[PDB]
Design a protein around this ligand. Sequence first.
Ligand SMILES: Nc1ncnc2c1ncn2[C@@H]1O[C@H](COP(=O)(O)OP(=O)(O)O)[C@@H](O)[C@H]1O
Ligand SMILES: Nc1ncnc2c1ncn2[C@@H]1O[C@H](COP(=O)(O)OP(=O)(O)O)[C@@H](O)[C@H]1O
Ligand SMILES: C[S@](=O)(CC[C@H](N)C(=O)O)=NP(=O)(O)O
Ligand SMILES: C[S@](=O)(CC[C@H](N)C(=O)O)=NP(=O)(O)O
Ligand SMILES: [Mg+2]
Ligand SMILES: [Mg+2]
Ligand SMILES: [Mn+2]
Ligand SMILES: [Mn+2]
Ligand SMILES: [Mn+2]
Ligand SMILES: [Mn+2]
Lengths: 489, 490
Amino acid sequence: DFITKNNLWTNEQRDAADKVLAEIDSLGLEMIRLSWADQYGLLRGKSLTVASLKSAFKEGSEVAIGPFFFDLVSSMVFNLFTTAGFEDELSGNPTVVMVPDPTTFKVLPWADKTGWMLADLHWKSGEPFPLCPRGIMKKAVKSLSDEGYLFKCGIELEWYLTKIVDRSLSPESLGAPGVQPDAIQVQPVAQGYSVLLEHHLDQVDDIMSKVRKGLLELNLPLRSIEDEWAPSQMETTFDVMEGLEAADAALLIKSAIKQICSRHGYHATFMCKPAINGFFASGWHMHQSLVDKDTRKNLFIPSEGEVLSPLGRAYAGGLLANGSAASSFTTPTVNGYRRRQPYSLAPDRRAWAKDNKAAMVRVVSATGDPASRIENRIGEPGANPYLYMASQIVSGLDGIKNKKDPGELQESPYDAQVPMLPTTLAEALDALEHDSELFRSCFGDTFIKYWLQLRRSEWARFLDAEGAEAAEPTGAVTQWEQKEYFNLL
Amino acid sequence: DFITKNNLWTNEQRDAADKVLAEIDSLGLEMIRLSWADQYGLLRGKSLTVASLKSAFKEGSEVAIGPFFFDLVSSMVFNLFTTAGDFEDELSGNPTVVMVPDPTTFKVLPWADKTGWMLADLHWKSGEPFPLCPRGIMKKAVKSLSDEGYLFKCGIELEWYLTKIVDRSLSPESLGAPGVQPDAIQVQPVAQGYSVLLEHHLDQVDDIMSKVRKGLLELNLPLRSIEDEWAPSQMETTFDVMEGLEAADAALLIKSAIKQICSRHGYHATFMCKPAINGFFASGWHMHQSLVDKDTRKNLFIPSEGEVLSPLGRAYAGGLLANGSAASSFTTPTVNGYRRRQPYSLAPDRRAWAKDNKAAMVRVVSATGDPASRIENRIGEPGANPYLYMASQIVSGLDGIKNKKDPGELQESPYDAQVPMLPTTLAEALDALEHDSELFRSCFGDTFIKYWLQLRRSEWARFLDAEGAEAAEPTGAVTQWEQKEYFNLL
Ligand SMILES: Nc1ncnc2c1ncn2[C@@H]1O[C@H](COP(=O)(O)OP(=O)(O)O)[C@@H](O)[C@H]1O
Ligand SMILES: Nc1ncnc2c1ncn2[C@@H]1O[C@H](COP(=O)(O)OP(=O)(O)O)[C@@H](O)[C@H]1O
Ligand SMILES: C[S@](=O)(CC[C@H](N)C(=O)O)=NP(=O)(O)O
Ligand SMILES: C[S@](=O)(CC[C@H](N)C(=O)O)=NP(=O)(O)O
Ligand SMILES: [Mg+2]
Ligand SMILES: [Mg+2]
Ligand SMILES: [Mn+2]
Ligand SMILES: [Mn+2]
Ligand SMILES: [Mn+2]
Ligand SMILES: [Mn+2]
């Protein structure tokens, strides 16, 4: 019993495991997917039979770390054939153990008799695997809990709904290791640039009603479905969730949207800005408040003369001060930097403002209002949820602990004289490299080295394919971006 | 609790909220839409889950005012990125407002999956009403009329086009851009025409029209008649008398339901006045209106033996006529609607009233002692914003009542009357409003009028740059700009 021997499950987790096995027998489920987010936030793993899952509830399930050493097209960035003497060399294909987390169990409503659960990656020694994004989120959550606070997050996701025309499965379109396969061919499902039009919601509801039902059956706190600005651009928002549960929920939300749509011949994409005429950039704005661990009261609520409590003001200051170093985490994709431009309802600057969607940090609050909170509009829909939320926790807590000041609330953020944000992924990586202390301390030195190496390899690929001129945010979306992100994100 | 704090719900509304939640639970609904009319009369908003709606019955639901600062194709007319120090003076920024649900408007949408529907009033986070909300302008008109002791009674008679969709124009090359018109939906007529009121036409189109009929009846809208209008595929739907804000709400829902049901079955219903399709003649929205007593609920327009209307109704008509040019942009808000401002079209080109003559702006339908006695204002277009159209009527008529204005002589031949001509272009309607702005600045609000003038002139400049002055003349052919501006959404 690997799990008990290394005391990897709390009592809550073990009892949850008992009730999960009961639900599996009662429903007659036949498969249970055991998955974990990779560096890109994509779910990787295996589907197990009932017997194999009950065995994994004791021994775990051995898996290889290959995904971490691959980019999205399986370029070998770190050599996988040499057993290392690991955290210093980042080489080899060592085996890790998927340790199931029973509290995350779900029945997938769109699949045949299939359940679903996340796993934490552990060395066979029993120590956590240092590249696991979920582990990084757990570390951030624990540091926040050590400071006496809980992270409350409202998930607000923009994405694109399209109808599949060709799945690009012909042999000649499959690429190779390090060679992008062809993008799926699609057709928009509705005109746009008539924001929040009810008729648009009705027009697409033959499929969106299935997405809605799937989310509701997964017991996710769906809050709203909305027609976004662009043609076929949708928005789904969720009620407030807390910490690790919130990150897991975002992961499942994106997975479920994509799988339901594909099951009915649609392609949902969280690629920031697809290379399709008429498609405007999508954003992932992170609504966030801190509550007291004990009182469970929103500690961002302002007084009469304030936009935020002094605690929320310092949290905003930390968000702004670290927004450049954290850019590669909030906006991991090269195509996410298409949003780094003015007059776009997306931030190009490290500025905060009250109820102004031109700013990076938008304060939504009223005196005494427990909904008072920060909206960070820097994120992209394809961000790894664990890294996005952990970067937010780390930045805000750095602001609180070092009592950093956000400065003046900016009326007219796009004319503000504040430090500019990175305009390319390379700039974001540069910003992290030269200001790495906070994230090396909180995310881990080994992880930051691995991250820098991998993301720079991807940037070199993009630059080799398209050239430097293309990186310009206002430029047209390149085919490299489409063939890197459209299918999988 | 935003709603209770600012005393935004009456007791009737709170009771309705309780029953709305009970019906939602009993029917097992999963989504409830919260919608509101924008400046154009188009429903904007969100679809909420049950839990989120239950929260919105206490705190409301935040939204941005973006729609008000966009035109139909999302040209940014007002800077949305500089927050204003004084919003009503600068009209800039993207401030947040609160959708406050109105539980008395709740409906189950019969054509959708487990979906309810409700209107919301936009309120500042301070708790004050949002000054550009069309429903608020109507609420203000209903209040001013009630203060004088009268109730607005309106019979909705909308004309519209029913076509079958051939191509939804969803190819990426057809989607447009911010401020750039997308391609019009391609359609096909459903029946020949120029055989007015033919029963066989009604039967021919009834495979879908029966669905529209059932949808309207299940929404408890007081449908009165379905009729074959003159042109090929031109329909008419009329409704029994409704009152004030409820009448405006009903018109809005009526148009929304017609369009959604038709689209659900592969048809396109359009309230664009005159589509750029060969053979399609202009559609009209004639507003039938009477005033009743707030207490006796008896028609105060009913004439005596030697009169076509009571003195109140004759003074109400005078107010309509005197202010008909200033109100033109409200009754006839689209460029395309001014294709009706021509002299032998059963549509008005002049500020004249007449008894039972459909050539005049104001047609009096009455008989001595007949509670059906009323005024028909034939100036409106089907694509009008119901709130602004009905409110313009209330405002003009009450102005006529208070100034005891004389409608003048009933015109036997309204198209030969030597009376002021009505504006022939949207630009002219805006000029007329600007030069005669007192009444509508006072009753609709000064900020709303400044905003309206700026927005509509920006749209007119777009049309003029795209088609030229030669095109504006009413009898000219309908331009591609008009089709691509109005066909899909109106
Ligand atoms: N105290 C809070 N802390 C964090 N998020 C919150 C809080 N209260 C509400 N939210 C969240 O804020 C989000 C609002 O989404 P949305 O209505 O799209 O905002 P906007 O469109 O103005 O950015 C929801 O995800 C909701 O869960
Ligand atoms: N007292 C009244 N006040 C306002 N409208 C009325 C009154 N009595 C009847 N109506 C309305 O008059 C309209 C008649 O429509 P219709 O017969 O199509 O008009 P038309 O005579 O122009 O063809 C209906 O909408 C009906 O509700
Ligand atoms: C209306 S928008 O500002 C659109 C944002 C844009 N798609 C972007 O962030 O790139 N999102 P929201 O109003 O929900 O906060
Ligand atoms: C037969 S008609 O006179 C023609 C109306 C025309 N479509 C118009 O443009 O106003 N309308 P209605 O019967 O409702 O009075
Ligand atoms: Mg939003
Ligand atoms: Mg009629
Ligand atoms: Mn949005
Ligand atoms: Mn947002
Ligand atoms: Mn007619
Ligand atoms: Mn009529």
